[PDB]
Every structure is written in structure tokens, then in C-alpha cells.
């Protein structure tokens, strides 16, 4: 870019205009490598955005926004340019979606595929899929403590079908925190759905 760091204040200031300014100079001087960076700094402004929700600025509006207008940058320089693989799911006993969604936009947008299962869902069928598609990440959403539960007996199941050690588990939810991940026995736990974006991009390479 011009200026990769600007860039990535931007996407932390949820900056549209100057988002898109940036983009569209990129996309004219149409340097694959150019582009990469600009989305690798657009990643790092991601996080900011969480560090801005944690503090209290933001609110769960703009973590709905930020996923959205990264899908939006990376759609646009697409053109210009082996993706990790998530099992995403809100587990057996719950009903609670809304989060983890916005994990999955923030995923989807950070270039993981990601195999959302949708609600409520069995151990017998996470585990199922993961033998499947053989993931990268297993993300584990829940609120409701029989839900705490099916997430330990998931990992559990993986534990006995052989899959655990090749893999990585992230939990989320409302009362998720390092209690609850050493019961679930869990490789990390998010403070919020840009955190967890930030803690799987640590992980894959």
C-alpha cells in the first residue's frame, strides 16, 4: 500500500471509506503480494477490533460489522491474488447461535473454511465429521451447563476415536473462561469472537 499500518487502523476504526481507499489502490497496481499484505494488515486491525470490544468502546454491533466488512475487502481483492479447516458447532443441549455466527463470518472472512453444523449437535455427529473432513480446529460453542457438558464429552470422544492430538479445540460461549476450558479440556477458550479469530490464526500456518 501506501501504508500498511494505517490500513490496519482502519479496519480497527471500522473506516469504510478508508478501507476502501486503500483497496482500490491496491486493486489498480494488481500485485498479488501487495494484496496479501494489505489483508495480512486487515487482519491484524481485527484484532484491534476485539481489543475494543473487551475494553468496553465497542458493543456487539461492531463485531457483527467488522466481520462483514472484512468479507467485503477480501471479496473485492480476491481477483488480485490450501485454507484451514474449522468444525464449527453450537453443541448438544443448546440452542444459542448468535455468537457463534459471528465467529463464523470472522472465520470465513479470515480465510478458514469452516463446516458449520449448525445447532444442538450431537457429540456422535461432530465427531462423525471430523473424521470426515479432518480439521485443523474443532469450535465448540455453548451457554447452558448441560451444554459445558456435551462439550466435554466431545472432546472426550475424540480422545477415544484417536483424533484429539491432531487437533485443536476452541471453546466459546457466554460463561466460557480458563475454568470451564481445563474442564472441557480445551486448548483455549475466546474472550470474544475476533480473540478466538486471533487465537486460530496463531495455531494454522
Given at each position: 500500500?501506501?501504508?500498511?499500518?494505517?490500513?490496519?487502523?482502519?479496519?480497527?476504526?471500522?473506516?469504510?471509506?478508508?478501507?476502501?481507499?486503500?483497496?482500490?489502490?491496491?486493486?489498480?497496481?494488481?500485485?498479488?503480494?501487495?494484496?496479501?499484505?494489505?489483508?495480512?494488515?486487515?487482519?491484524?486491525?481485527?484484532?484491534?477490533?476485539?481489543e475494543r470490544?473487551?475494553?468496553?468502546e465497542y458493543?456487539?454491533?461492531?463485531?457483527?460489522?467488522?466481520?462483514?466488512?472484512?468479507?467485503?475487502?477480501?471479496?473485492?481483492?480476491?481477483?488480485?491474488?490450501?485454507?484451514?479447516?474449522?468444525?464449527?458447532?453450537?453443541?448438544?443441549?443448546?440452542?444459542?447461535?448468535?455468537?457463534?455466527?459471528?465467529?463464523?463470518?470472522?472465520?470465513?472472512?479470515?480465510?478458514?473454511?469452516?463446516?458449520?453444523?449448525?445447532?444442538?449437535?450431537?457429540?456422535?455427529?461432530?465427531?462423525?465429521?471430523?473424521?470426515?473432513?479432518?480439521?485443523?480446529?474443532?469450535?465448540?460453542?455453548?451457554?447452558?451447563?448441560?451444554?459445558?457438558?456435551?462439550?466435554?464429552?466431545?472432546?472426550?470422544?475424540?480422545?477415544?476415536?484417536?483424533?484429539?492430538?491432531?487437533?485443536?479445540?476452541?471453546?466459546?460461549?457466554?460463561?466460557?473462561?480458563?475454568?470451564?476450558?481445563?474442564?472441557?479440556?480445551?486448548?483455549?477458550?475466546?474472550?470474544?469472537?475476533?480473540?478466538?479469530?486471533?487465537?486460530?490464526?496463531?495455531?494454522?500456518?
Amino acid at each position: 500500500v501506501i501504508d500498511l499500518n494505517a490500513s490496519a487502523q482502519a479496519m480497527s476504526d471500522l473506516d469504510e471509506g478508508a478501507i476502501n481507499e486503500v483497496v482500490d489502490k491496491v486493486m489498480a497496481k494488481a500485485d498479488a503480494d501487495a494484496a496479501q499484505e494489505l489483508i495480512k494488515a486487515f487482519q491484524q486491525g481485527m484484532t484491534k477490533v476485539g481489543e475494543r470490544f473487551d475494553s468496553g468502546e465497542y458493543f456487539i454491533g461492531d463485531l457483527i460489522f467488522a466481520g462483514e466488512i472484512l468479507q467485503a475487502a477480501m471479496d473485492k481483492l480476491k481477483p488480485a491474488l490450501k485454507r484451514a479447516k474449522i468444525v464449527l458447532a453450537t453443541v448438544e443441549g443448546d440452542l444459542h447461535d448468535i455468537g457463534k455466527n459471528i465467529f463464523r463470518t470472522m472465520a470465513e472472512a479470515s480465510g478458514f473454511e469452516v463446516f458449520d453444523l449448525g445447532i444442538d449437535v450431537p457429540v456422535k455427529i461432530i465427531v462423525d465429521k471430523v473424521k470426515e473432513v479432518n480439521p485443523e480446529i474443532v469450535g465448540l460453542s455453548g451457554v447452558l451447563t448441560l451444554a459445558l457438558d456435551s462439550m466435554r464429552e466431545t472432546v472426550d470422544a475424540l480422545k477415544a476415536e484417536g483424533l484429539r492430538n491432531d487437533l485443536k479445540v476452541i471453546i466459546g460461549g457466554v460463561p466460557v473462561n480458563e475454568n470451564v476450558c481445563q474442564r472441557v479440556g480445551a486448548d483455549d477458550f475466546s474472550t470474544n469472537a475476533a480473540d478466538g479469530v486471533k487465537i486460530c490464526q496463531r495455531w494454522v500456518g
